[PDB]
Design a protein around this nucleic acid. Structure first.
Ligand SMILES: [Zn+2]
Length: 252
DNA sequence: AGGTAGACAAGGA
DNA sequence: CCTTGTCTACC
């Protein structure tokens, strides 16, 4: 899921689990648990805590319990669902949180790329994986000034800079390409080569792109297809080690 | 040390 | 062979 989908999961999942008390945690693929290292410690510490909240940081879900925060990344194919303990589990269910009311929060993930970390609430933000995470793209903490400061002192391409989680939280490949298209900037351009006007434009389009999605693509996955603005065939190359999509006419 | 590239996760085609 | 973010590892 992208940031906008994670935000939708956050909003939808919260009412389904808030106030519920954990009676058991069952783990069928221990590698998903990254902290505590021992998945049995992870299971044992969550028992008896009640779910109090659910927040989002970039693409991370942060489950707030009594003492602890559970930090969850779905990556590609991770999914949460709430269902009865009486029903057979669906395939690829790797972690189950059982509540005292007989319902369960089930974590499914065909890839098994997702991760979970549990820390005391007050420590979560200063440990991995949340430590060093950049500002929310929809917050005033993400500003043209902040973007310019990073752009100026790097040799990297603008795409690589935007994919840096320390620069801005949760901007993935899709929204970087889309935002760069809307701002008229070639992804392979050196970040330090951007004018102030371009930084401001890029910031504005980044916020619009994310903002619209949370609340139809131009370039991503559309190589060979006509640009929706000028009709020129969309192109695809490799920038910053990844498939990159752009309009060779509209982006400069 | 400090900036930054890519190793790593792992199963489905 | 391929998929993707990111945090550890590298120079
Ligand atoms: Zn175009």
């Amino acid at each position: 899921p992208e940031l906008p989908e994670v935000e939708t999961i956050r909003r939808t999942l919260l009412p389904l689990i808030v106030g519920k008390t954990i009676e058991d945690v069952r783990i069928f693929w221990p590698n998903i648990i990254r902290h505590p290292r021992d998945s049995e410690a992870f299971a044992a510490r969550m028992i008896g805590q009640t779910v109090r909240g659910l927040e989002r940081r970039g693409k991370f879900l942060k489950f707030l319990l009594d003492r602890d925060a559970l930090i969850s990344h779905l990556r590609m194919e991770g999914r949460y669902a709430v269902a009865s303990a009486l029903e057979p589990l669906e395939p690829h269910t790797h972690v189950v949180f059982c509540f005292t009311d007989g319902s369960e929060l089930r974590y499914r993930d065909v890839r098994k790329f997702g991760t979970m970390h549990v820390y005391a609430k007050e420590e979560a933000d200063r440990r991995p994986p949340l430590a060093e995470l950049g500002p929310e793209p929809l917050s005033p903490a993400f500003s043209p000034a902040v973007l310019a400061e990073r752009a100026v002192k790097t040799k990297r391409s603008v795409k690589a800079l935007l994919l840096d989680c320390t620069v801005v939280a949760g901007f993935g490949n899709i929204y970087v390409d889309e935002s760069l298209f809307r701002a008229g900037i070639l992804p392979g351009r050196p970040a330090a080569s951007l004018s102030s006007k371009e930084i401001e434009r890029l910031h504005e389009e980044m916020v619009a792109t994310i903002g619209e999605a949370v609340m139809h693509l131009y370039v991503y996955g559309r190589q060979g297809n006509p640009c929706k603005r000028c009709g020129t065939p969309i192109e695809k190359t490799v920038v910053a080690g990844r498939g990159t999509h752009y309009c060779p006419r509209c982006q400069r």
